[PDB]
């Protein structure tokens, strides 16, 4: 499921600095001598929290190794409250590679291009059938212990 989600999110990666300057130079020389809204993976903790609260996010992927874990403990409950499907992924460095940064505490996808909307929908259903109900009973229970 992480492989499927990262296939979709690799389809919707943002642009690096080189591609952005290259594109801007292209528009500059085109003006010297028409577009739709860009669709990218949304990142940044405060930005993603604002997207979840306004019910704009469609799928939320939360890293599991945020060292100040307070920055993300309320995030599964927040996604549950506002109704956005979420999943916990292994590695903030993995989410970082996707957004061209060293790390990323959380990423979110809000809307996509037409040609893979169905795929996104299936992925959403996948996590809400493959991760959310396997977590549903153990999300409430205390963990750990040395009983035995």
């Amino acid at each position: 499921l992480a492989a499927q989600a990262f296939k979709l999110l690799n389809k919707y990666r943002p642009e690096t600095k080189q591609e952005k300057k290259e594109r801007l130079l292209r528009e500059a020389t085109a003006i010297k001598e028409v577009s739709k809204k860009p669709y990218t993976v949304k990142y940044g903790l405060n930005h993603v929290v604002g997207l979840i609260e306004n019910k704009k996010a469609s799928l939320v992927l939360i890293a599991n190794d945020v060292d100040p874990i307070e920055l993300v403990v309320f995030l599964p409950a927040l996604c549950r409250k506002m109704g956005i499907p979420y999943a916990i992924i292994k590695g903030k460095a993995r989410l970082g590679t996707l957004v061209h940064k060293k790390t990323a505490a959380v990423v979110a996808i809000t809307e996509v291009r037409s040609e893979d909307k169905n795929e996104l929908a299936k992925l959403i259903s996948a996590v809400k059938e493959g991760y959310l109900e396997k977590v549903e009973d153990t999300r409430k229970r205390w963990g750990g212990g040395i009983m035995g």
Binding site: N10, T16, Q18, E19, T97, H100
Partner: protein, 296 residues
């Protein structure tokens, strides 16, 4: 550090950044140029030109063998093509200036001795044949020898061509070289006893003979017109044997035109060695050949 960066870009999934980093690396398989800049080391090691010729002996020997050697991971194909082009440009220099003096062939191959600025250079070429590299051999130090001697022979070629006034690098077109022009691919334009041997005669070499060495010898001493078969190469005279213009035809076989004279490459070699025109009757085909000598 740049290898670390390109490995980082490959592991990060950035194909475009990987392309940018490998463009910046100048890795010597897509270019053929030596990987590092070796101007200052060869400047400090060789202060003048005759030491460059003295080491160019071994440098040019290495490069001729390497041009007749195949390609592996440690020795790619593009700088082998550069070896071929640079050796052929050097041969064009020799056939323009007639700097070649002595030529002795053998079961090694052929050694050639040429004088440049009063300095003798001896260099050996093997035959056009499959060479086995069996045994324990290291090819990385081979590649180091390669890029070192591309640096030396390129700078020696540029210095010598500026000394003689010929422009460098002389142009060659890819169409006729891809048809097999070999020594006829490179065009040289003058501004940006050897000559009396084969001054005005007509030469043709047949389908059996090694085309490269006898063409090198014939053009080295100013023979005006040398032709060969259509399958041996491209960019020559008429390949028909019925043409009466050709006087001497080099054959070695186990037509018979009366005006045409049938000779063997041993006759060419002894005429080059002795400078006295050893006779074609004594070196006629179909008979046991009298011995020659190594003039060194």
């Amino acid at each position: 550090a740049l290898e670390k960066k390109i490995s980082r870009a490959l592991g990060r999934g950035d194909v475009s950044n990987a392309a940018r980093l490998e463009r910046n690396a100048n890795l010597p398989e897509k270019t053929g140029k030596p990987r590092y800049t070796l101007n200052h080391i060869i400047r400090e090691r060789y202060p003048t030109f005759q030491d460059a010729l003295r080491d160019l002996d071994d440098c040019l020997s290495m490069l001729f063998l390497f041009a007749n050697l195949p390609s592996t991971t440690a020795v790619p194909a593009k700088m082998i093509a550069r070896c071929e082009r640079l050796c052929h440009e050097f041969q064009h220099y020799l056939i323009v200036t007639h700097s070649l003096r002595k030529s002795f062939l053998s079961i090694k191959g052929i050694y050639y001795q040429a004088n440049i600025q009063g300095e003798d250079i001896l260099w050996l070429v093997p035959y056009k044949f499959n060479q086995r590299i069996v045994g324990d051999v290291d090819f990385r130090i081979m590649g180091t020898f390669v890029e070192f001697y591309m640096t030396l022979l390129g700078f020696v070629n540029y210095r010598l061509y500026t000394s003689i006034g010929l422009k460098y690098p002389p142009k060659f077109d890819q169409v006729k070289d891809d048809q097999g022009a070999e020594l006829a691919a490179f065009s040289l334009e003058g501004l940006n006893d050897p000559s009396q041997l084969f001054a005005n005669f007509t030469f043709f070499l047949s389908r059996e003979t090694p085309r490269q060495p006898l063409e090198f010898i014939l053009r080295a001493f100013g023979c005006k017109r040398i032709g060969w078969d259509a399958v041996l190469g491209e960019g020559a005279f008429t390949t028909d044997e019925s043409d009466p213009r050709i006087t001497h035809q080099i054959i070695d076989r186990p037509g018979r035109y009366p005006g045409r004279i049938y000779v063997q490459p041993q006759w060419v070699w002894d005429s080059i060695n002795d400078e006295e025109l050893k006779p074609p009757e004594l070196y006629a085909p179909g008979a046991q050949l009298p011995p020659h000598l190594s003039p060194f």
